[PDB]
Design a protein around this ligand. Structure first.
Ligand SMILES: *[C@@H]1O[C@H](CO)[C@@H](O[C@@H]2O[C@H](CO)[C@@H](O[C@H]3O[C@H](CO)[C@@H](O)[C@H](O)[C@@H]3O)[C@H](O)[C@H]2NC(C)=O)[C@H](O)[C@H]1NC(C)=O
Ligand SMILES: *[C@@H]1O[C@H](CO)[C@@H](O[C@@H]2O[C@H](CO)[C@@H](O)[C@H](O)[C@H]2NC(C)=O)[C@H](O)[C@H]1NC(C)=O
Ligand SMILES: *[C@@H]1O[C@H](CO)[C@@H](O[C@@H]2O[C@H](CO)[C@@H](O)[C@H](O)[C@H]2NC(C)=O)[C@H](O)[C@H]1NC(C)=O
Ligand SMILES: *[C@@H]1O[C@H](CO)[C@@H](O[C@@H]2O[C@H](CO)[C@@H](O)[C@H](O)[C@H]2NC(C)=O)[C@H](O)[C@H]1NC(C)=O
Ligand SMILES: *[C@@H]1O[C@H](CO)[C@@H](O)[C@H](O)[C@H]1NC(C)=O
Ligand SMILES: *[C@@H]1O[C@H](CO)[C@@H](O)[C@H](O)[C@H]1NC(C)=O
Ligand SMILES: *[C@@H]1O[C@H](CO)[C@@H](O)[C@H](O)[C@H]1NC(C)=O
Ligand SMILES: N[C@@H](CCC(=O)O)C(=O)O
Ligand SMILES: N[C@@H](CCC(=O)O)C(=O)O
Lengths: 220, 373, 275, 85, 50, 49
């Protein structure tokens, strides 16, 4: 941007807080820096929402991020008996068919039995190769996230506060927020460690950051 | 308001008697909100240009109704005269360049807002101002499922390379030699039964052992070939994404195209390394997305390059069509307006608010995520 | 001299930038820059102890042929162990075959210009035909190296690269010997590449394309340094990816072994007819 | 008696029927184990190291991947001069 | 190294696999390359499993 | 398989020198005939285990 728009920039990073939050009418973070005319613009991983767009002017988005959930991916009619014995081809001594039709259907049924065994083995192999998408939850609209107290089994989800995700959840789902606040977490790396060791089940955070963390994870 | 006929977003249907359509209901019981749109008839080049009031409904119409509810204004919806979104085209008078389609109608004052799946890009943004994107999606390729279909019950095992005739000749020779050996050795029915059942039941023993081993290894190879076939073998000549040699190395045997005077056309024109694709596509670029989709269904086409939000919906509706999972040039659908205008900030804020809550998710469920398979 | 070399020598042009190969006779009359793409010459072509053995070995494959029954407890235990080992051996063999077939690979060919067929193809009853285009570095090199090969090539002389490609495709020609870079590009951009180059081009001159400047021209040092600068910054790879890409960047031995084994078993059985 | 037959059913009134259905169970479980192991020894294959120089592991150094060249050579100059490496 | 030996007069030629690059070519003179080759990565990517 | 930074092994020599042109001419001539191929086959293409 500096090359194209032909401007020179003075770069610094804010220590007043996280990306942005309004505490008692006073903004903090990069949003506070831009809003109070202490900086001309902010370049970090800053999310666009209605609350921030009301006070400042956002540019066009240059990478798509929503909110996402990360998990740890933790002598005729009695021939049926002989026919079924040959289905498992156990060579059970019972009798001997003598007719041409008898021999033909015996051979056809032996061929059918062997191909049925082969198809079963192949089907099991193909099923084992395929990887089922074993997902803990369908998404946020899931019943677990909404009312964990109203359901007997508990499960743990949390986020990093003072972010866009916390504001979104506060505005939308109040019971979910009240359950999530007591399970609050400090950092993204701390949340990943907690997910790895099992202290937490689901981590709700930014889509791009979680995608990058999943991509470069050790152990996949 | 000016808009265009795009099936997932703007359905356009004829009226029943006078400025009214059948009051449909969604499967969830919520009535469908339809609006009256005055637009031209089906055929543009070969039919007279007389406007008729049809009725439009869909994703974009619901979004427009929500906008009018939030930002207090009334609307008068009409369709764009030609089925073109809008590009900067050379006019054969004065050697100038001008905008056509919805872009031209908006810039000329014929409309005050473009509520349609209008792609945001730098070419259009230099003359009009977009809102924050109300959709995120890229370009993708629409194809079909196999030439006609997949095989049902795997043709009872394709027996790839059966060489079955030679195998049967070998078993016939072995059976004949077995009968000869048994007759020489110190029993037609017994030998025939043994020859058939040897697969499952001095020299006769060793012959039995070698025959059992050979049939055993044959059945092992047969099981292995079936398993390999039904674990991996399934694509037969797929144009996997845009990186396939069929599209990378163009030929008249394989035909792919896009919609003329659209965003994809100028996207392919702008790029330098896709000039071969642009030349191969410009010959037979279609007038509208529906015509190209029908041509794909009728085999006049072989691949269609278009926005993912439309092609995925069409693949969901039509089971005989499919789309590759690839994506390129991810972009967004926003709402076009003129230069600095009073509605711009509130339109952007309303779209952001709808994104924050589930309204856009509700629209996706109602119009895009409702599939039949 | 004619062509680009003629233009450069006769001071009509300061330098030539086209696909110009570096060799000795041209370097005697013009000054060449450092090579910026390696091009040799390559070849394009078209695509109870005595009776227990049989009982045990038949019990390996579970053929279920009643013969007799073991008596020893140790014998029974070892029989069960050995039959189970046979079963797991069959399972592992089936798994190995599945892994083998699900694995896939491709073939190639190396040979060389000095192959017997290339020297004199009269040994082959239908004499396979190979040829070049004249007015080239490849033709001059082949004339200087093997006059007999050039004399044979004269019977299949032709003009164009695309003409050679269509002649190979239609069967009118067998092998096309030509510049390595051009043949590599054609192989890359051939639809399905029914045409393939013999390995990589490394057999003959394996020189490179250069900028042919005038003899003693002051531009030589600057051009060489600029080309090496482009090589060092990776811009050369970017240009190559922009311009030079392409598409292409049931048993015999085992079946013969099985056939030999079954034939030997039958033959030994027939021999043992007397005793 | 029939106890050994049971052990041997895998290979060799209504008691015979029960033995037959049990032999069928034995065959199906052996086939299941065969398919399981066949998928097991096919799916596990660590390619890890990617042939590319564009592999992310090379671009992002870590403890588990150590790579270097000869000191004071042409590769040293090549990696020094390019600012994106 | 070898470049310093050649430039300081201790040697008159460098007959060795000396890679041609822009940095060295500013001071010394290279012949037409006698071996065309690029860079590559050697690994012990061999897993004696099974 | 990804061969990056394609370059060449050549013979180093000082600035303008009597043996500058003739070394390059001799190397080119050896490339024209099979001498370089002979050396490659003798010392490089000797594939062993
Ligand atoms: C999210 O924002 C919260 C405020 O809106 C913030 O709470 C603040 O947290 C800090 C430390 O995390 C507290 O400071 C405490 O520790 C310092 C250490 O030097 C002491 O000097 C202080 O007196 C105090 O004991 C603040 O008191 C606390 N303020 C409030 C209003 O809660 C969270 O930490 C933020 N969470 C993040 C960034 O993950
Ligand atoms: C919301 O829409 C209503 C329409 O009912 C607007 O009410 C009109 O207000 C205008 C002046 O602003 C009057 O001229 C009309 O007589 C009113 N119509 C009626 C019947 O209410 C109202 O102004 C709008 N809210 C806004 C934009 O302030
Ligand atoms: C855009 O939305 C803002 C909402 O804040 C509108 O501003 C308000 O407009 C009403 C109109 O009746 C006034 O009574 C308020 O005093 C305004 N408040 C502020 C903070 O400006 C604005 O009018 C809207 N613009 C358009 C073109 O609809
Ligand atoms: C190779 O060079 C020869 C020598 O000029 C070319 O022969 C000429 O061919 C054209 C067309 O066939 C004739 O009009 C000329 O009279 C020929 N020249 C002579 C001196 O006889 C030959 O065409 C060249 N081949 C290629 C492929 O360029
Ligand atoms: C639109 O024009 C076409 C062309 O004549 C005609 O067939 C069609 O009936 C017209 N539609 C209406 C609604 O009149
Ligand atoms: C030339 O331009 C006129 C209007 O300027 C238009 O009506 C006509 O169709 C054009 N001719 C073409 C595109 O061949
Ligand atoms: C270069 O070779 C030429 C003959 O080709 C000869 O006259 C001259 O002396 C040689 N110079 C050196 C230094 O090798
Ligand atoms: N970039 C995000 C941080 C992630 C999050 O808050 O969930 C933001 O500006 O809020
Ligand atoms: N580039 C080659 C032409 C092709 C060839 O004959 O090798 C030359 O300069 O002669």
């Amino acid at each position: 941007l500096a090359k194209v728009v032909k401007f020179s920039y003075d770069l610094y990073l804010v220590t007043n807080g996280k990306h942005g939050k309004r505490v008692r009418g006073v903004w903090n973070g990069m949003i506070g820096e831009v809003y109070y005319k202490r900086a001309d613009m902010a370049i970090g991983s800053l999310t666009i929402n209605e609350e921030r767009s009301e006070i400042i002017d956002f540019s066009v988005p240059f990478v798509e991020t929503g909110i996402s959930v990360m998990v740890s991916r933790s002598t005729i009619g009695k021939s049926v008996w002989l026919l079924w014995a040959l289905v498992f081809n156990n060579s059970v001594p019972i009798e001997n068919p003598r007719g041409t039709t008898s021999k033909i259907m015996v051979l056809v049924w032996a061929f059918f039995a062997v191909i049925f065994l082969a198809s079963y083995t192949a089907n099991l192999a193909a099923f084992m190769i395929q990887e089922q998408y074993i997902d803990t939850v369908s998404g946020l609209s899931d019943k677990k996230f909404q009312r964990p107290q109203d359901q007997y089994p508990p499960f743990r989800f949390g986020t990093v506060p003072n972010g866009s995700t916390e504001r979104n959840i506060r505005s939308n789902y109040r019971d979910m927020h009240t359950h999530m606040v007591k399970f609050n977490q400090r950092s993204v790396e701390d949340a990943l460690t907690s997910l790895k060791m099992g202290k937490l089940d689901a981590f709700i955070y930014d889509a791009a950051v979680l995608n990058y963390m999943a991509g470069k994870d050790e152990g996949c | 308001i000016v808009t265009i006929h795009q099936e997932p977003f703007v359905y356009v249907k004829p009226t029943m008697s006078d400025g009214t359509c059948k009051e449909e209901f969604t499967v969830n019981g919520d009535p469908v909100k339809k609006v009256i749109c005055t637009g031209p008839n089906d055929t543009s080049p070969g039919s007279p240009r007389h406007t008729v009031p049809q009725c439009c409904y869909g994703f974009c119409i619901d979004l427009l109704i929500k906008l009018a509810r939030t930002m207090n204004f009334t609307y008068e919806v009409h369709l764009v005269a030609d089925g073109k979104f809008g590009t900067q085209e050379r006019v054969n008078n004065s050697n100038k360049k001008e905008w056509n389609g919805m872009m031209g109608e908006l810039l000329s004052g014929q409309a005050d807002m473009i509520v349609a799946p209008l792609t945001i890009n730098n070419e259009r943004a230099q003359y009009i101002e977009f809102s924050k994107p109300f959709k995120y999606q890229g370009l993708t390729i629409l194809v079909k499922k196999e030439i006609p279909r997949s095989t049902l019950d795997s043709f009872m095992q394709p027996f790839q390379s059966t060489l079955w005739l030679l195998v049967g000749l070998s078993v016939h020779v072995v059976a004949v030699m077995l009968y000869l050996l048994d007759r020489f050795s110190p029993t037609l029915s017994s030998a025939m039964w043994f020859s058939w059942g040897v697969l499952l039941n001095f020299s006769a023993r060793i012959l039995g052992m070698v025959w059992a081993g050979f049939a055993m290894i044959i059945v092992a190879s047969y099981t292995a070939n079936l398993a390999a076939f039904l674990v991996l073998d399934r694509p037969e000549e797929r144009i996997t994404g845009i990186n396939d040699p069929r599209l990378r190395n163009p030929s008249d045997k394989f035909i792919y195209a896009t919609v003329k005077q659209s965003s994809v056309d100028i996207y392919f024109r702008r790029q330098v390394e896709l000039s071969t694709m642009y030349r191969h596509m410009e010959k037979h670029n279609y007038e509208s997305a529906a015509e190209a989709i029908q041509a794909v269904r009728d085999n006049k086409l072989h691949a269609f390059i278009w926005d993912s939000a439309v092609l995925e919906f069409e693949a969901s509706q039509k089971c005989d069509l499919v789309t590759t999972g690839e994506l390129f040039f991810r972009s967004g659908f926003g709402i076009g307006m003129r230069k600095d205008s009073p509605w711009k900030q509130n339109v952007s804020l309303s779209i952001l608010k709808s994104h924050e809550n589930g309204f856009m998710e509700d629209l996706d469920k109602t119009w895009v995520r409702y599939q039949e398979c | 001299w004619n062509g680009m070399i003629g233009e450069v020598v006769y001071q009509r042009a300061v330098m030539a930038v086209g696909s110009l190969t570096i060799n000795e006779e041209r370097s005697e009359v013009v000054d060449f820059s450092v090579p910026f793409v390696e091009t040799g010459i390559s070849v394009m072509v078209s695509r109870t102890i005595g009776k227990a053995i049989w009982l045990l070995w038949g019990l390996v494959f579970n053929n279920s042929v009643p013969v007799q029954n073991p008596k020893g407890t140790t014998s029974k235990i070892m029989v069960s162990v050995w039959a189970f080992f046979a079963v797991i051996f069959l399972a592992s063999y089936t798994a190995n075959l599945a892994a083998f077939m699900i694995q896939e690979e491709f073939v190639d060919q190396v040979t060389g210009l000095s192959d017997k067929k290339f020297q004199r193809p009269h040994d082959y009853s239908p004499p396979f035909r190979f040829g070049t285009v004249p007015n080239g570095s490849t033709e001059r090199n082949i004339r200087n190296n093997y006059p007999y090969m050039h004399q044979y090539m004269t019977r299949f002389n032709q003009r164009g690269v695309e003409d050679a490609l269509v002649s190979l495709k239609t069967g009118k020609l067998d092998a096309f010997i030509y510049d390595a870079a051009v043949l590599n590009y054609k192989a890359g951009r051939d639809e399905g590449c029914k045409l393939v180059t013999i390995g990589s081009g490394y057999i003959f001159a394996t020189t490179g394309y250069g900028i042919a400047l005038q003899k003693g021209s002051p531009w030589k040092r600057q051009i060489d340094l600029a080309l090496l600068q482009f090589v060092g910054d990776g811009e050369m790879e970017e240009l190559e990816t922009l311009w030079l890409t392409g598409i292409c960047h049931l048993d015999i031995d085992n079946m013969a072994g099985v056939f030999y084994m079954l034939a030997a078993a039958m033959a030994l059985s027939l021999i043992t007819f007397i005793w």
